[PDB]
Amino acid sequence: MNASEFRRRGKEMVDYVANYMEGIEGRQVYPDVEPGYLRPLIPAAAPQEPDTFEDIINDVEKIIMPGVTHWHSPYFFAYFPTASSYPAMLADMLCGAIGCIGFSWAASPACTELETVMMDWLGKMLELPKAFLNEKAGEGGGVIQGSASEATLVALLAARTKVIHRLQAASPELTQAAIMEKLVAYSSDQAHSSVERAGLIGGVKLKAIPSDGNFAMRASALQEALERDKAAGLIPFFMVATLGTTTCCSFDNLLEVGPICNKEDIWLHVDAAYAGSAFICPEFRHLLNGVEFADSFNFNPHKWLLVNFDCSAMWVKKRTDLTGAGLITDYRHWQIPLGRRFRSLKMWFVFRMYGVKGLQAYIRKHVQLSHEFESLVRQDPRFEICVEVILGLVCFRLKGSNKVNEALLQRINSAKKIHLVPCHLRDKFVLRFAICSRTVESAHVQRAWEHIKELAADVLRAERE
Amino acid sequence: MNASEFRRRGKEMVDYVANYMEGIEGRQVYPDVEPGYLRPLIPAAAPQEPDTFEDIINDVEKIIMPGVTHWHSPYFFAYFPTASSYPAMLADMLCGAIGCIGFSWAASPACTELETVMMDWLGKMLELPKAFLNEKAGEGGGVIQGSASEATLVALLAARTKVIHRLQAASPELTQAAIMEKLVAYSSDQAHSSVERAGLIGGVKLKAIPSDGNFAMRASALQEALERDKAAGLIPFFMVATLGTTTCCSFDNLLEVGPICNKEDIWLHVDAAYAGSAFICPEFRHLLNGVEFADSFNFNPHKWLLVNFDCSAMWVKKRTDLTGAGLITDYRHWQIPLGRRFRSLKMWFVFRMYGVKGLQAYIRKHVQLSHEFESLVRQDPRFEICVEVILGLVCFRLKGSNKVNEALLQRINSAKKIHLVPCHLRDKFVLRFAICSRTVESAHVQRAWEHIKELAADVLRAERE
Ligand SMILES: Cc1ncc(COP(=O)(O)O)c(CNN[C@@](C)(Cc2ccc(O)c(O)c2)C(=O)O)c1O
Numbered sequence: 001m002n003a004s005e006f007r008r009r010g011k012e013m014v015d016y017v018a019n020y021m022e023g024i025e026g027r028q029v030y031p032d033v034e035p036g037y038l039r040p041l042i043p044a045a046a047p048q049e050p051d052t053f054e055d056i057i058n059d060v061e062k063i064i065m066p067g068v069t070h071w072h073s074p075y076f077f078a079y080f081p082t083a084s085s086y087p088a089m090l091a092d093m094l095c096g097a098i099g100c101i102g103f104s105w106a107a108s109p110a111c112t113e114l115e116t117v118m119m120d121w122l123g124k125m126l127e128l129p130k131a132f133l134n135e136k137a138g139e140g141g142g143v144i145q146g147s148a149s150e151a152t153l154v155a156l157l158a159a160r161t162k163v164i165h166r167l168q169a170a171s172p173e174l175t176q177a178a179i180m181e182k183l184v185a186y187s188s189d190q191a192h193s194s195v196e197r198a199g200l201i202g203g204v205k206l207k208a209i210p211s212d213g214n215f216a217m218r219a220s221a222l223q224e225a226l227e228r229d230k231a232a233g234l235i236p237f238f239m240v241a242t243l244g245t246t247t248c249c250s251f252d253n254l255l256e257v258g259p260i261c262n263k264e265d266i267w268l269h270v271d272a273a274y275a276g277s278a279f280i281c282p283e284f285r286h287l288l289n290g291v292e293f294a295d296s297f298n299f300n301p302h303k304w305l306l307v308n309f310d311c312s313a314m315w316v317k318k319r320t321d322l323t324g325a326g327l328i329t330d331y332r333h334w335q336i337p338l339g340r341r342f343r344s345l346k347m348w349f350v351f352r353m354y355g356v357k358g359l360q361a362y363i364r365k366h367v368q369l370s371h372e373f374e375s376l377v378r379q380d381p382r383f384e385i386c387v388e389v390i391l392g393l394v395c396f397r398l399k400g401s402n403k404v405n406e407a408l409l410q411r412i413n414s415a416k417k418i419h420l421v422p423c424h425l426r427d428k429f430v431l432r433f434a435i436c437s438r439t440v441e442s443a444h445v446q447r448a449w450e451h452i453k454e455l456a457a458d459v460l461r462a463e464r465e
Numbered sequence: 466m467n468a469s470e471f472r473r474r475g476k477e478m479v480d481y482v483a484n485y486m487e488g489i490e491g492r493q494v495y496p497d498v499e500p501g502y503l504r505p506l507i508p509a510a511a512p513q514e515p516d517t518f519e520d521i522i523n524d525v526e527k528i529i530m531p532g533v534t535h536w537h538s539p540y541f542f543a544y545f546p547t548a549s550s551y552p553a554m555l556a557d558m559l560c561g562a563i564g565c566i567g568f569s570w571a572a573s574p575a576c577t578e579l580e581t582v583m584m585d586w587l588g589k590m591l592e593l594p595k596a597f598l599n600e601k602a603g604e605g606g607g608v609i610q611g612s613a614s615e616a617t618l619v620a621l622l623a624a625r626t627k628v629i630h631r632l633q634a635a636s637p638e639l640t641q642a643a644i645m646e647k648l649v650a651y652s653s654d655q656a657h658s659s660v661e662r663a664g665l666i667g668g669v670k671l672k673a674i675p676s677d678g679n680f681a682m683r684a685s686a687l688q689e690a691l692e693r694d695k696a697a698g699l700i701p702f703f704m705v706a707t708l709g710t711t712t713c714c715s716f717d718n719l720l721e722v723g724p725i726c727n728k729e730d731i732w733l734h735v736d737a738a739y740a741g742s743a744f745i746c747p748e749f750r751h752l753l754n755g756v757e758f759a760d761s762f763n764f765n766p767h768k769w770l771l772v773n774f775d776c777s778a779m780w781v782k783k784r785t786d787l788t789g790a791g792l793i794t795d796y797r798h799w800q801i802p803l804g805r806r807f808r809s810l811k812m813w814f815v816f817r818m819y820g821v822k823g824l825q826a827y828i829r830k831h832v833q834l835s836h837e838f839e840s841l842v843r844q845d846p847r848f849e850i851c852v853e854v855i856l857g858l859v860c861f862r863l864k865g866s867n868k869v870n871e872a873l874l875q876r877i878n879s880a881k882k883i884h885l886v887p888c889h890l891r892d893k894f895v896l897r898f899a900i901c902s903r904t905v906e907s908a909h910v911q912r913a914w915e916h917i918k919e920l921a922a923d924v925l926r927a928e929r930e
């Protein structure tokens with residue numbers, strides 16, 4: 001293609017995208033295809049001569065869309081939201097056009113420099129302690145990671161290098177491998193699987209701290225684990241404290257866990273992948289209190305701050321602690337990959353085109369809708385809410401057996417009107433209702449509950465026979 | 466933004482992108498800004514109320530573009546090409562609109578299933594051994610990684626897990642840490658820094674194999690290193706053999722190194738980040754002979770196959786060896802991150818809109834232009850070519866001291882008409898000329914050489930005084 005043909009086809013793509021978005025409520029949210037559906041429907045080899053754009057876009061509708069789960073349908077209530085906004089889409093077109101690989105300052109100065117400023121913009125919107133901000137001064141700063149899973153790995157690796165160097169400074173004869181045998185990392189029993197994966201990749205032991213009745217990590221359980229493992233000869237070195245657990249959006253107590261991690265020389269990484277976006281609202285900022293004790297803090301604008309994937313935001317207090325693993329000129333030693341694209345354009349466009357107040361309104365509407373769903377559940381005594389509703393997630397279930405709730409879930413996902421996923425809280429099977437779509441409204445939440453309520457009656461009937 | 470506003474602004478963005486691309490030859494390839502230029506030019510905090518699109522796009526031109534290194538200018542001859550094509554741009558708009566996170570089959574079936582087919586399309590274009598292809602049969606298959614640096618890490622981690630399990634099967638009392646002390650990985654002394662980083666992240670020793678006069682890894686040097694390290698008690702477990710080294714586009718000998726790695730139970734990873742795209746042309750496929758001995762093979766469509774970053778293509782012979790670290794339903798255990806976007810749409814669009822013959826013509830034009838530059842250098846006896854020219858890279862220098870070539874480079878990069886970077890080959894400072902832009906032509910290559918030739922005269926004059 002030349003640029004003149006892209007002028008025509010790019011504008012046709014813009015219309016196609018806007019059409020898909022404007023009609024998305026008419027899409028079945030979860031697909032009917034079975035695993036393996038796609039390969040029989042397209043050729044076994046690439047074409048030798050070019051295909052037409054018309055044939056390709058026809059295949060998008062005919063072959064791709066039947067296998068799409070529509071994350072941005074208002075009836076998608078699964079997992080956590082992922083971001084979809086037109087400002088991020090516009091920036092992503094510009095990002096691909098500039099097309100730089102920012103593995104060094106010289107590879108495109110603006111790619112690195114805009115990113116550092118946007119991470120300070122974001123840090124200030126979250127009212128982060130100044131130690132995390134760059135502002136061309138001090139030792140802290142922020143970087144975009146590809147994902148919170150990668151951000152957790154990066155923090156673990158930095159923590160690993162820091163403790164190896166400290167332990168070898170104390171015992172110069174001590175090998176890296178002898179230290180490796182004794183290192184242990186911690187997270188909540190509600191932590192995301194990215195923590196377990198970081199421990200496996202990092203080659204260290206990982207232990208779950210039992211959570212309290214609110215599924216929060218507390219000082220007492222942490223102290224009990226530390227006493228046990230230190231007596232066994234393990235060396236605590238890394239902690240992931242979670243704000244907004246994937247299971248039930250619970251919150252680890254940083255005011256309790258922070259001081260303990262500091263005094264134990266445990267690198268404290270705060271994972272707020274989903275919940276972090278709400279901390280731009282002052283009524284939720286208290287859930288972040290204690291981040292001043294953290295060594296690193298991470299959350300995903302690409303979940304709940306309208307910056308399309310990929311965009312994970314990570315700050316550290318000491319750049320030097322992170323690199324070994326004022327002006328920031330490159331990010332090579334802040335991330336796993338060397339190459340990176342101009343992702344800060346997406347943050348710039350979203351922040352500027354929505355404004356801080358526009359993002360706050362977006363968060364608050366989602367939380368209000370969550371409370372609307374919760375209100376409906378609390379009116380039906382056949383159901384129970386298992387965890388306090390704070391952000392855009394409601395954990396609910398039919399009172400009674402796990403089997404009846406497994407049946408309810410299977411009826412919901414078989415009817416394919418809405419989409420949600422479950423979790424386990426201890427031995428209890430629980431349904432999750434996550435407010436996801438940028439365009440979801442009260443009417444969608446109410447119809448989803450009406451649907452759930454109807455299927456529950458059929459399921460409860462079948463259990464008495 | 467709503468969809469109706471995106472219809473208007475998205476089409477204005479398409480025009481802006483096409484304008485930038487059509488005028489790109491008028492851009493100064495390398496910028497005049499100094500590190501730190503950007504922060505004083507934009508506000509210290511995000512705006513509370515929205516800014517206009519017009520103000521944002523004005524800032525792109527006023528503030529961002531002065532800090533852009535124009536990778537896609539025809540006068541960019543630095544590093545290696547990165548991909549920029551309009552089919553990939555169109556697919557990337559559709560990718561952001563579908564906006565799924567494909568961390569599981571259910572999160573969007575098409576996101577995983579198209580990817581597996583495209584990796585077979587690509588594998589067949591490279592005439593890979595069938596053991597690497599999926600085709601819903603056997604044990605092999607391919608995945609998109611975010612980068613070759615990540616692909617190398619993933620292979621090292623899989624190799625690490627495989628050798629730990631084998632050594633523990635032989636000695637059940639042996640701890641992971643005791644094994645960690647003895648593991649050693651290998652690469653060429655010309656290997657990319659991503660290998661050293663994978664070794665650091667993976668917690669294993671890494672040793673460089675001395676390259677021959679053609680900067681290739683050969684059996685003799687590999688055998689000499691193996692005898693030394695095995696006698697010292699090290700356990701060889703991982704090898705990165707490079708096809709198309711970053712320094713001088715040299716090629717490790719897989720026909721020699723492959724059988725050695727197999728008999729030593731060394732996981733052989735073939736890194737062809739840049740050169741791999743040329744292997745779709747039969748006249749270059751012989752440079753890949755011996756990949757049948759590899760356990761994993763990787764190259765970057767986002768360098769030299771017009772699939773905009775990010776898109777790194779990695780194949781393995783045994784999915785089970787990779788996951789522990791027929792139908793493919795998820796890629797969670799193939800990559801470092803859990804989340805991933807619908808990147809295979811970019812491969813689909815590029816492959817279909819260019820056709821295999823269009824991609825072959827693109828490769829061959831770049832190689833011809835490389836040989837055109839080489840021809841000009843070989844006509845000037847003040848210069849020498851340090852390594853055989855095979856693909857789109859020419860390694861050249863003024864005969865004489867490193868200091869005179871350092872002066873030549875500084876004059877080139879100070880005049881800001883073209884952009885190139887150097888390397889070291891042993892103790893020798895060498896200039897690299899890489900054919901990069903999709904729209905580069907003979908006329909650009911000839912003007913670049915005319916420029917280099919002129920600056921060399923001034924530099925040689927200043928050395929005789
Ligand atoms: C609490 C928590 N911590 C870390 C991560 C990992 O984030 P990332 O995907 O960027 O590596 C998560 C992941 N949330 N995983 C979900 C909710 C799936 C998901 C939804 C929306 C997204 O934008 C992403 O990236 C993932 C899951 O089902 O596991 C997390 O919740």
Ligand SMILES: Cc1ncc(COP(=O)(O)O)c(CNN[C@@](C)(Cc2ccc(O)c(O)c2)C(=O)O)c1O
Pocket residue numbers: 101103337338339544545546547548611612613614615657659707709710711736737738739765767768774777
């Ligand atoms: C031989 C070789 N192996 C691995 C890598 C790493 O690839 P990736 O960037 O995907 O992690 C490379 C990297 N090449 N690095 C260049 C040539 C910079 C560069 C140019 C164009 C790109 O598309 C990327 O991603 C990077 C460098 O200067 O180091 C490699 O050459």
